[PDB]
Amino acid sequence: AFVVTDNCIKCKYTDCVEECPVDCFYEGPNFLVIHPDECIDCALCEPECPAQAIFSEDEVPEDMQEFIQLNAELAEVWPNITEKKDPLPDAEDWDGVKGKLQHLER
Ligand code: SF4
Ligand code: F3S
């Protein structure tokens, strides 16, 4: 499975979803997550995220390992999203800012 990590938070561009043949992205107020059981590892979503926030589960940075479990868990409670939407208003301002996990909304 592929995993959405820290730089997605407060950006949430949503270009990722248009690439997904199986529709396994789930939406939060300021973050997206992939469902690990539905994802087929097609990788088609990774070169298309402007925030370079998606990684193969085995290529997820040492300092972001907690996102693997977070994607699995929130994918069970958030609604599916299959259509591209406008990025969050100040996405450029937040793209590249580290430790944005402190800003994650449920
Ligand atoms: S790797 Fe493929 S199946 Fe998994 S979330 Fe990305 S586009 Fe969807
Ligand atoms: S910012 Fe988040 S919404 Fe999709 S396009 Fe990147 S994983």
Tab-separated table of C-alpha atoms and ligand atoms in Angstrom:
chain	number	residue	atom	x	y	z
A	1	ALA	CA	0.000	0.000	0.000
A	2	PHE	CA	0.959	3.611	-0.594
A	3	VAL	CA	0.835	6.218	2.237
A	4	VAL	CA	-0.022	9.946	2.538
A	5	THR	CA	2.448	11.633	4.875
A	6	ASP	CA	2.956	15.030	6.621
A	7	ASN	CA	3.224	17.580	3.714
A	8	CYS	CA	-0.379	16.839	2.592
A	9	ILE	CA	-1.735	18.448	5.801
A	10	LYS	CA	-3.002	22.030	5.187
A	11	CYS	CA	-2.370	21.611	1.418
A	12	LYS	CA	-4.670	18.808	0.277
A	13	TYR	CA	-4.236	19.472	-3.449
A	14	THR	CA	-6.293	16.312	-4.352
A	15	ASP	CA	-4.600	15.679	-7.766
A	16	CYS	CA	-3.963	12.189	-6.340
A	17	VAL	CA	-7.476	10.934	-6.608
A	18	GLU	CA	-7.805	11.340	-10.422
A	19	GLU	CA	-4.973	8.733	-10.830
A	20	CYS	CA	-6.543	6.021	-8.557
A	21	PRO	CA	-8.197	3.172	-10.628
A	22	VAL	CA	-9.691	1.654	-7.488
A	23	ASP	CA	-10.883	4.818	-5.703
A	24	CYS	CA	-9.240	4.228	-2.327
A	25	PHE	CA	-8.673	7.767	-1.060
A	26	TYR	CA	-10.587	9.057	1.955
A	27	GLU	CA	-11.137	12.646	2.937
A	28	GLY	CA	-10.498	14.639	6.046
A	29	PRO	CA	-10.985	18.441	6.662
A	30	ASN	CA	-7.318	19.195	5.824
A	31	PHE	CA	-5.723	15.805	4.874
A	32	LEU	CA	-6.308	12.713	2.709
A	33	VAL	CA	-5.476	9.107	3.534
A	34	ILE	CA	-5.208	5.858	1.456
A	35	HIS	CA	-7.021	2.712	2.487
A	36	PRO	CA	-4.294	-0.067	2.716
A	37	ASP	CA	-6.570	-2.908	1.976
A	38	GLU	CA	-7.998	-1.402	-1.215
A	39	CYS	CA	-4.804	0.135	-2.662
A	40	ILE	CA	-3.264	-2.158	-5.370
A	41	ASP	CA	0.196	-0.415	-5.324
A	42	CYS	CA	-0.239	0.903	-8.854
A	43	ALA	CA	2.037	3.885	-7.787
A	44	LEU	CA	0.150	6.127	-10.252
A	45	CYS	CA	-0.662	8.591	-7.577
A	46	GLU	CA	2.795	9.247	-6.280
A	47	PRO	CA	4.297	11.452	-9.222
A	48	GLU	CA	1.154	13.544	-9.282
A	49	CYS	CA	1.081	14.892	-5.672
A	50	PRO	CA	2.531	18.530	-5.702
A	51	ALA	CA	3.416	18.193	-2.105
A	52	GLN	CA	5.493	14.961	-2.851
A	53	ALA	CA	3.647	13.607	0.148
A	54	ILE	CA	2.889	10.093	-1.046
A	55	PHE	CA	5.357	7.223	-0.507
A	56	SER	CA	5.353	3.417	-0.996
A	57	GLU	CA	4.860	2.018	2.531
A	58	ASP	CA	8.443	0.610	2.502
A	59	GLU	CA	9.879	4.033	1.393
A	60	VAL	CA	8.113	6.152	4.087
A	61	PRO	CA	10.780	8.345	5.928
A	62	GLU	CA	12.045	7.206	9.268
A	63	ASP	CA	10.570	10.367	10.865
A	64	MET	CA	7.135	9.827	9.397
A	65	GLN	CA	6.510	6.124	10.247
A	66	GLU	CA	3.402	7.018	12.388
A	67	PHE	CA	1.549	8.044	9.230
A	68	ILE	CA	1.303	4.344	8.082
A	69	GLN	CA	-0.994	3.447	10.941
A	70	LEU	CA	-2.738	6.806	10.769
A	71	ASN	CA	-3.792	6.218	7.114
A	72	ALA	CA	-5.126	2.757	7.981
A	73	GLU	CA	-7.212	4.065	10.870
A	74	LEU	CA	-8.665	7.256	9.448
A	75	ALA	CA	-9.483	5.441	6.111
A	76	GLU	CA	-12.081	3.549	8.170
A	77	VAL	CA	-13.891	6.654	9.464
A	78	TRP	CA	-13.580	9.341	6.712
A	79	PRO	CA	-15.778	9.527	3.492
A	80	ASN	CA	-14.508	8.368	0.122
A	81	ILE	CA	-13.281	11.109	-2.323
A	82	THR	CA	-13.017	10.224	-6.130
A	83	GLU	CA	-13.021	13.654	-7.777
A	84	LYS	CA	-10.380	16.369	-7.907
A	85	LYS	CA	-11.210	19.448	-5.880
A	86	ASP	CA	-9.531	22.927	-5.489
A	87	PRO	CA	-6.536	22.851	-3.135
A	88	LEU	CA	-6.911	24.371	0.314
A	89	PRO	CA	-6.726	28.183	0.195
A	90	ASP	CA	-3.233	28.668	1.461
A	91	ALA	CA	-1.690	25.448	0.280
A	92	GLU	CA	1.465	27.128	-1.169
A	93	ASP	CA	2.133	28.716	2.178
A	94	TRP	CA	2.061	25.357	3.937
A	95	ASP	CA	3.826	23.247	1.246
A	96	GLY	CA	7.301	22.440	2.700
A	97	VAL	CA	6.507	23.271	6.301
A	98	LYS	CA	7.616	20.462	8.528
A	99	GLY	CA	5.840	18.857	11.449
A	100	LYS	CA	2.370	19.702	10.220
A	101	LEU	CA	0.973	16.704	12.083
A	102	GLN	CA	0.312	19.091	15.024
A	103	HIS	CA	-2.327	20.755	12.704
A	104	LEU	CA	-4.186	17.613	11.595
A	105	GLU	CA	-7.970	17.820	11.910
A	106	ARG	CA	-10.340	14.894	12.559
B	1	SF4	S1	-1.105	3.418	-5.360
B	1	SF4	FE1	-2.767	3.246	-6.833
B	1	SF4	S2	-4.380	2.086	-5.813
B	1	SF4	FE2	-3.040	2.890	-4.151
B	1	SF4	S3	-3.865	4.883	-3.522
B	1	SF4	FE3	-2.339	5.357	-5.173
B	1	SF4	S4	-3.547	5.304	-7.128
B	1	SF4	FE4	-4.876	4.385	-5.526
B	2	F3S	S1	-1.579	17.108	-0.982
B	2	F3S	FE1	-2.869	15.367	-0.110
B	2	F3S	S2	-4.844	15.610	-1.198
B	2	F3S	FE2	-3.616	14.134	-2.516
B	2	F3S	S3	-2.623	15.623	-3.999
B	2	F3S	FE3	-1.132	15.336	-2.286
B	2	F3S	S4	-1.847	13.457	-1.157
